[PDB]
C-alpha cells in the first residue's frame, strides 16, 4: 500500500511532535520530499484546528475516557463519524489528524507514549482504507500541501 506507507509516516510524526512539543529533525524515508512539506503544513493547520476546537476536543476526550492502548485502538468506532454523512474534505481530514494529535498530547500526560503508535495506525486506517479514491483523485499529500498552502 503506497498511500498508507506515505500517510502513516506523515501522521505519526505530527502526533509524536505534538506529544513532545519538539520537532523530529531526522529525514523521512517513505514520504520523501512530499512528507516534509506535509508535516510543515500539518504543524501549521492542525495547530489552528486544535485552538478552534480545544473545547470540542476536550469535550470528546472527557466523554471518551482514554487510559490504555485498547481505548486508543477502539477510537476507530467514533473516528469514522467525521465521514459518516457523505462529506469528504481536507478540513474533515486535518480535524481527524488534529484530534488524534490532541489525544497524543493527552496520552503523554497519562504516560502513554507507547499508545501514540496504535493511535497513528488507527487514524491512517480510518483515513486511507475508507477515503482512498478521494485521496488519489485529490493528488494525495501533494494535494494536501497544495490545498492548505496560503502565501
Amino acid at each position: 500500500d503506497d498511500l498508507y506507507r506515505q500517510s502513516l509516516e506523515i501522521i505519526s510524526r505530527y502526533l509524536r511532535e505534538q506529544a513532545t512539543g519538539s520537532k523530529d529533525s531526522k529525514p523521512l524515508g517513505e514520504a520523501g520530499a512530499a512528507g516534509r512539506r506535509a508535516l510543515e503544513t500539518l504543524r501549521r493547520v492542525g495547530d489552528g484546528v486544535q485552538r478552534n476546537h480545544e473545547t470540542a476536543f476536550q469535550g470528546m476526550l472527557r466523554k471518551l475516557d482514554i487510559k490504555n492502548e485498547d481505548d486508543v485502538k477502539s477510537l476507530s468506532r467514533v473516528m469514522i463519524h467525521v465521514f459518516s454523512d457523505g462529506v469528504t474534505n481536507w478540513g474533515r481530514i486535518v480535524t481527524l489528524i488534529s484530534f488524534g494529535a490532541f489525544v497524543a498530547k493527552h496520552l503523554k500526560t497519562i504516560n502513554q507514549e507507547s499508545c501514540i503508535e496504535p493511535l497513528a495506525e488507527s487514524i491512517t486506517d480510518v483515513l486511507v482504507r475508507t477515503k482512498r479514491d478521494w485521496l488519489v483523485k485529490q493528488r494525495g499529500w501533494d494535494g494536501f500541501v497544495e490545498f492548505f498552502h496560503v502565501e
Epitope: R139, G140, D142, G143, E146, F147, H149, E151
Partner: antibody, heavy 119, light 110 residues
C-alpha cells in the same frame, strides 16, 4: 511580482526532440501543481500535462501520452517537458500555468513558447 | 473536444451574452468549470473559477453557472473589448486529465 517564463521552444524536425523549460518566480513553486497547456496557432487550447508539487502525481493528455514526459525541479523553480518524436501536428505555442490548490484554477499563466515541427 | 463550446457567439453592446460549455458526468458533473479569457494577442488569464467565482480584476458583469453537466458563462454588459476566445476547462475523473472546450470567439457587432 509573480511570473512564469517558458524557454526552449523553436525549430525541430519531424522526429526530433525538444525540452521546453518553464521558470517560476515570486512564489513558492514547491507548493503548487504545474501544467503545460499547448495551443496550435489559430486553434483552441489543449491541455498536455500536469505535475503535482513534489512530482508524485503525473497526468498526460492522450495525444502527448508516451511521447512527452513532464518533470519539475523544486530546487531550480523549473518545470520541464521532454517532447520526443515530435510530429508536424505538435506545432503549437506551449504555455505554462500554475494551479491554485484550492480550486485547481490555472491562475498564473506564462507568455508561451512557440514550437514549430518542420523539415 | 470533450467539453463542447460554440465556435462563435456574439452580441451588440450593452446586451447579455452567454457562452455555454457542454460537459459530462465525469468532467463538469463531478468537478468545477473554470473559464479563461484569451484576448487577441495575449496568453489566457483566469476569468472565472469554481463555476462562478471571479478573481481579482474580473468585473461583476462576468457571471458563471453550472447546470448539471453543462456550464454557461454570462458576460452581462457587453463591451467591444470582450473580443476574445473564452475557454472553459474541467478536470475529468474518467480521463484523469484536464480538458478545455473548443473555444468561443466572442464578437461585438453594434
Amino acid at each position: 511580482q509573480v511570473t512564469l517564463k517558458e524557454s526552449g521552444g523553436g525549430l525541430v524536425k519531424p522526429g526530433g526532440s525538444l525540452r521546453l523549460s518553464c521558470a517560476a518566480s515570486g512564489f513558492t513553486f514547491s507548493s503548487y501543481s504545474m501544467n503545460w497547456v499547448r495551443q496550435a496557432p489559430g486553434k483552441g487550447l489543449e491541455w498536455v500535462s500536469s505535475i503535482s508539487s513534489s512530482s508524485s502525481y503525473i497526468y498526460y493528455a492522450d495525444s502527448v501520452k508516451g511521447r512527452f514526459t513532464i518533470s519539475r525541479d523544486n530546487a531550480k523553480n523549473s518545470l520541464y517537458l521532454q517532447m520526443n518524436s515530435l510530429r508536424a501536428e505538435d506545432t503549437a505555442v506551449y504555455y505554462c500555468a500554475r494551479q491554485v490548490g484550492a480550486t485547481w484554477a490555472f491562475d498564473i499563466w506564462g507568455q508561451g513558447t512557440l514550437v514549430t515541427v518542420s523539415a | 473536444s470533450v467539453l463542447t463550446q460554440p465556435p462563435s457567439a456574439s452580441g451588440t453592446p450593452g446586451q447579455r451574452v452567454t457562452i455555454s460549455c457542454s460537459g459530462s458526468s465525469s468532467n463538469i458533473g463531478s468537478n468545477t468549470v473554470n473559464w479563461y479569457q484569451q484576448l487577441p494577442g495575449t496568453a489566457p488569464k483566469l476569468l472565472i473559477y469554481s463555476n462562478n467565482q471571479r478573481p481579482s480584476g474580473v468585473p461583476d458583469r462576468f457571471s458563471g453557472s453550472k447546470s448539471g453537466t453543462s456550464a454557461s458563462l454570462a458576460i452581462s454588459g457587453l463591451q467591444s473589448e470582450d473580443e476574445a476566445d473564452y475557454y472553459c476547462a474541467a478536470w475529468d475523473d474518467s480521463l484523469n486529465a484536464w480538458v478545455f472546450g473548443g473555444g468561443t470567439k466572442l464578437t461585438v457587432l453594434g
